[PDB]
Design a protein around this nucleic acid. Sequence first.
RNA 1: AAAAAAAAA
Length: 646
Amino acid sequence: KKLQGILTLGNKNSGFIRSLDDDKTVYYVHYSNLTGALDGDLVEFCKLDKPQFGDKFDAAVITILKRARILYAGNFLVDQNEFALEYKIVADNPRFYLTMIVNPDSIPNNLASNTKIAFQIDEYDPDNNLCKVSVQQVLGNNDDPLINIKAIMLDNSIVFETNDVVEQHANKLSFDTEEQHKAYRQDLTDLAFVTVDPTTSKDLADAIYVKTIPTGFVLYVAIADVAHYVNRNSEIDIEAKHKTSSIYLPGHYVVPMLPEQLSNQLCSLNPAQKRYVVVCEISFDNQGRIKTNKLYPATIISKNRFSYDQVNKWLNNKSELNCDETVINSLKAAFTLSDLIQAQRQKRGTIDLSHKETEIVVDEHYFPIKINFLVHDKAETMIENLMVVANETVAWVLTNNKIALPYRVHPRPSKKKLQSLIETVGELNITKPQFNLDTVTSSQIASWLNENKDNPSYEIFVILLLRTLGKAFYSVNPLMHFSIGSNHYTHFTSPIRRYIDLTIHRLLWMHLFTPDQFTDNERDQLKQELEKIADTVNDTEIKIINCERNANDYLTTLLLSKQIGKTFSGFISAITSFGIFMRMDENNFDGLIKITTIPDDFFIFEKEKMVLKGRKTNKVYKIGDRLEAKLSEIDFIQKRAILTLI
RNA sequence: AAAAAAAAA
Ligand SMILES: [Mg+2]
């Protein structure tokens, strides 16, 4: 018969097709055999008669079954030649390789050159890779960095435009004063809950209070009661389900999963306002082992809105925070519990995969200024520990009550991927591990990292381990979370900005808090949808991560384009057939050193060790080597910084 | 070129 699979385009816009079969078989397809297909398209293909060159079969596309996109971002150009106007579009995406004939009836008379637009394909000629396109949206000035970020979101299918019906529905909502007197809702408004968040955030989902008892501690994790305001399958909910999460882009810019009157006002646990929450209350003994837990709706008043910067500076006795003594005692008790919890998590097995992370600072016109390294201090570590224990507790409560739910899962990595990792890292003098590769535990990977922290190449070690370990995702099947270290885990603590957390809250309400206010058909309708919700969230998480990486590259190469001629030190992060990727120390960005212009020899890529070796002199470039290199150009088409060795 | 845990965002 005929085969079917998804096309992925890479270097030079050749690529491969991943079949939909059981084996997920991979076939190579050269540019010349794409027959009009674009990156991400689902295609029908045939396997060519020609004998396999090696590695895998080569393929050709027969037809396109379903396009990955309907709109594409691009730059519109107009010029006058003779007495006739000429239109051109240059697609933002370098994998959009078709030559475009612009339908003139789609061009407003007032559309000026160098305007970012979105277009659709009206027709295509598979034999010449030329197509007719129509402008569908005018986005704005092509030189404005914010317009390019919005184009990137559009190119990744990420909704960002205001939805007028949804904003009007959200503006109708208000605080129901009578909800707090419900018998099922515990009044906790006297307790000294507080919030600790980055200084600029206005969506505050979580508040904490920790009390000491003679036998140990009681922790209160209060999470904004989003399900109270957002009814399932309402206009607001449907839009939230489409987004699946809030998006945070550089420089301030947030696309919220929920509109602002909810995300930053009615649900945000803002200081001094009465707010409805769902509380996970956990009592601990003096060893930090969970003794009991209860979940229940409540009312709170946050007493203080703190930043991470404020709490960390207070920790080092440099400055101090203006709050009641009950808050001070809760914060001190929260830190004691958090250090204690951290110790219990390491004992049970948990993999600390921390590494360098960055953010891009932009000015008032969205132009990038500099790159900052992020820190993850005690206060951020403290909140993280309390949020993890609540998430894990809720996962177990729902499982124990036999309620189907979406877990946050992370499977054990395969034996083959680990062995591949082991060989790669031996050239970096990372110890060979002693554990069994089929059975290796979280505890054993953590110990393995530990016996190597002082190695100069520990940073790239963690990078390679992170790729070996792979993606976490959501699943209704009760799979383990290998890197966190638990057999059951979910996302409960952030429903203002993640749709899964909202779903978890709904499950709590419908099965445990007020099952009597819902019918069995409501419970079964949600149960039947869980796997589709997990699928959409997983698919959209990929799009968001790709969107962030596009924006990081666009903004970082735009910033470096003004620093041509500076020399940067760094280390080799990857070796490819077309050259070396070097990660620059000062900005954590990978630049490309093209193979052809490496000095002193002619270098050949050898896939065996993933090195470049010089045909004479035996010079070897390998992953991890320290380098110094010159910034020679910015490739604005592919958004790669190109470097030359010094 | 390829890709990633956790947490607050
Ligand atoms: Mg928070």
